[PDB]
Amino acid sequence: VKKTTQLKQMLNSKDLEFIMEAHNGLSARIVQEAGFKGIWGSGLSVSAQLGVRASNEASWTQVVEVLEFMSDASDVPILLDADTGYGNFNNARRLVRKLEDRGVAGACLEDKLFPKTNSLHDGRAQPLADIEEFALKIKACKDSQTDPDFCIVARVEAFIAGWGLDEALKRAEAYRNAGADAILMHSKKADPSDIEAFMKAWNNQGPVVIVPTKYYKTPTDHFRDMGVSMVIWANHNLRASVSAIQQTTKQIYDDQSLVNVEDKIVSVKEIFRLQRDDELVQAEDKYLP
Amino acid sequence: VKKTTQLKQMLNSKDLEFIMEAHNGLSARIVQEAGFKGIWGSGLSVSAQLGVRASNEASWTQVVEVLEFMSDASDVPILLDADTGYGNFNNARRLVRKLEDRGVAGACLEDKLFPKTNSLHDGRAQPLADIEEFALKIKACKDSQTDPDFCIVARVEAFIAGWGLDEALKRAEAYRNAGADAILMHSKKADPSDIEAFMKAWNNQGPVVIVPTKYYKTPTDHFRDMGVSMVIWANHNLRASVSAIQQTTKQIYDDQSLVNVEDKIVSVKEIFRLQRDDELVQAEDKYLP
Amino acid sequence: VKKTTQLKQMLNSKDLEFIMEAHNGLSARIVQEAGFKGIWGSGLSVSAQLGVRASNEASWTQVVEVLEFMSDASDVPILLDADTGYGNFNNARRLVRKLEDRGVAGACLEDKLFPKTNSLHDGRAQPLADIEEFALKIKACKDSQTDPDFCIVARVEAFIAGWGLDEALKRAEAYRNAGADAILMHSKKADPSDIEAFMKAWNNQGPVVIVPTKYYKTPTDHFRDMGVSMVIWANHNLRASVSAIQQTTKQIYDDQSLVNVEDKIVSVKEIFRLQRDDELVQAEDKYLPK
Amino acid sequence: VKKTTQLKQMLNSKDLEFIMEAHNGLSARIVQEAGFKGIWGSGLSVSAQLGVRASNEASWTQVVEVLEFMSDASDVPILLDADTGYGNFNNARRLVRKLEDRGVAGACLEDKLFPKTNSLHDGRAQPLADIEEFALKIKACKDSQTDPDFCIVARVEAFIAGWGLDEALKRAEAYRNAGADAILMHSKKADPSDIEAFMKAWNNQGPVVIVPTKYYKTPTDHFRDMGVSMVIWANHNLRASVSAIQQTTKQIYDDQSLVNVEDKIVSVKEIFRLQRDDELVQAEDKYLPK
């Protein structure tokens, strides 16, 4: 079954689904091997592994190539955190076609104003992309896909930006009506109130995706009770990697020896297995004289 | 001081120097922050993070771009594990110019036959690149660099391939005479005998670089006693990352919650700091109205 | 009707087919609008447009990227001249998988030693890739396609390398038996004698592709008579482009004016048409608020 | 003499300078061999050769990559038409840093709204990027160059956008004050009236670059009289290339022969020369065993 279809089924299923963040081919393979039915191509993680910020410093094609390697290394669908589509509807649909061709299952586009044009840090709510413009962007992507199952998730930034439930609902409905396959409802809060308020008002007009990072103490059954469709574990592999690399690097730096890390890290043979080195060995014996 | 010069000084200094493996921009930054004077752009790690094998599946330009991101994220020199130069002398010197332009400090080229043309698994020693050909490849790289301090490290595979000290010495001397800035003498052994045998016979004709991965129990002072110039901690950040990602992924998969990983990984704010998010914030306040 | 299938039908059709060289997205669209049923992604042309030599200087992914834009800009199949596959069978199949993914219809691989290991130029015949190695490379490529109709064309370098017909025949049969969709038989003669000799000895064991650049005075019907499946017009758009650019640049350099070129070149409106600018104009009208 | 410096001296020289458009490594080398002291990395040409529209469809890194091959194939400075910098000041400076690193000598940024947010076509004058935003973008670019001589040219869209001379002057002064090495003043008229009006009001506050594509009948000496620093021949190699490719492809399509093109296009030997194939031949002789 196509990865696009796999993701689409997840978004539309009656069960709470989960997708795990991965930021490179290696990361993607590990997530797949763990049993996750889906991968979250975190915009934060992809940019951070590259050493750059998540402000579209890396080009959209550079992001796409990272995801191409991720897609090549996984059988489960990857939902790409594509920010706002890297431009207008045209850049978004072009991105969609490229993701589609590389095997990526869907793209998550957010209704934030892009790029940042001013710098005002008052208490005001932050203006977002015009609703009709973003709805038309969603429509353009849906209209441009060649795989009817490719998914477009519309991330509503109303709560994050300082607006309220009414703005969140209006945007969610506009994007869902524009054809979004799911709505990712997000919040900056350390509790699930925004999510709760939205789900109550949403009346299940379509699948809802959430990112519990800040309110991670919330019992997962509470999301099920609310009919949430999918949970995204957004950036934990990247955060775990940094801890390990920082710890491993300092230890070696301090010891000028490998004695205190050798027993704490996977073997090199485990690395070869993750690269599927044996498939190549077999291939070499078959295709080389 | 230029990164090339930084690396060159390290190779020629009277002290045992160390460089730590890094496989992406994030990794490179962490190694730098830890205090390492140099970074080892591991061929194994770069390919593995991409989810592919270390058999030049990723193109040389794809490797170069990974290193471009690494170089952009570090001030210390990166010595790239460039396998055999991805082709003949011409591909090697072209690679050298691109690495040079991206800020990479040096390239390590090995005298293995590339690409693998046959598959015979007998006990015979494995044939390597013709000595004159490889020496000429080294010469071409040295002759093509526009930065006189860019470094070319010649990795001698004689011991690994099954040949002995005499072949290792002959190759080392030929490459050193061809202008190699240092000789990386490697072995597959779980003890330092090959390294010991070579250093005894080498009579310090030039800097020697080693990779203690398999004989990591060896006391580091023993390398100093032998006059080794540099130690490469080859792949430990990649191996540490995989352990963390595998552990973190399984935990979340099992718990369907973040409660058991949140306290074990770096915060998201630590990720922003590694991306130098504050420099951008400052820049936005200065360059945006 | 996938491009792969289109190219495959052309190779297996009963008529002499023709593919025109193109080296970028722009020339690919022009070749298509001209009515050509196929495009030749020339190694000489693609490397030349980039300003590098045709010796694997640009990486295979940079080449694939050029081909991606060409594929996007054309509805007809593109057959890429992929040298030897940029490495061994593994590099070759990964290349095929990437070309498939981007809409490229086929790849032409040649059996020469790669990369160059020595510079001896004595009159001797140049050694080629080991017949079995290359045959297995072809098989590895066929075995790894996800699209059954993707085409692998095997170019035999025997005549060019100095070997005779026997060796040209041996290699071709070997590559055909390995699964090549067609054999590209080439020679460095200014006459079609190597081709006539091979076609006679071949005995229609498979579609044969030729490049008549050097023996261009040979009537095309002669190729139909020999039962040649396809002809490649290998590099004339690149050569024509260079002539035009040199003359135009020279004219402007000398005149310090555009007066003597403006009437000899396409208008800017034609460029916009070739870019399909109007489609975007239409899309903005539909997808951007008023 | 770095390319950056070369381009900068041209912008600040007392003579009317000229840069020829090129869109790939091949045309860049041709422009150079013709004697042009500079190259115009046209946004129209680069996007067109790729077969896409000039609306930021190809990513900035794909554009930079094309420019990298162009830089490698030329010894004279290339001024890249970088639209608006592909985003805000941050995307613009990262672009400048990458262009510097690859040998590109300068970047031309324009003050139009990017990307397009709406499709209203009422007669109204089109709004542009906020003058302060763009000025700060220019400054951010100047502030981030590692090479002091890298050039930032600011293209003013006021006349084209429907605004008058006052606004064209306001923007230009603003961008010049921010540190632009030159101002590219453009108009969509078939006469140089907008340029004459601006040059008169400008009062030589800085080098001015123009593109006389639309008013090409205007004597070039007239631009010298106005004190114009540089002229850009914006897209004639691309236009000439398209003419040549269409004719050549058509000729071959109709004749199913190369007979009527072989004598009208450059020989293959000229392509090898342009690729500098002989240098590689010489290098192999020296670096490959016998």
Swiss-Prot record, chains C, D:
It catalyses: phosphoenolpyruvate + H(+) = 3-phosphonopyruvate. Belongs to the isocitrate lyase/PEP mutase superfamily. PEP mutase family. Formation of a carbon-phosphorus bond by converting phosphoenolpyruvate (PEP) to phosphonopyruvate (P-Pyr). Its cofactor is Mg(2+). InterPro entries: ICL/PEPM, PEnolPyrv_PMutase_core, Pyrv/PenolPyrv_kinase-like_dom, Pyrv_kinase-like_dom_sf. Homotetramer. The lineage of its organism: Eukaryota, Metazoa, Spiralia, Lophotrochozoa, Mollusca. Pfam families: PEP_mutase. This is Phosphoenolpyruvate phosphomutase. The active site is at A54. Changing H186A: Strongly reduces enzyme activity. Its EC number is 5.4.2.9. Mg(2+) binds at A54. One of its GO terms (biological process) is organic phosphonate biosynthetic process. Pathway: Phosphorus metabolism; phosphonate biosynthesis. Keywords: Isomerase, Magnesium, Metal-binding. Changing N118 to A/D: Strongly reduces enzyme activity. It comes from the Eukaryota. PANTHER family: PHOSPHOENOLPYRUVATE CARBOXYLASE (PTHR42905), PHOSPHOENOLPYRUVATE PHOSPHOMUTASE (PTHR42905:SF7). One of its GO terms (molecular function) is metal ion binding. Transmembrane segments: none annotated. It comes from Mytilus edulis.
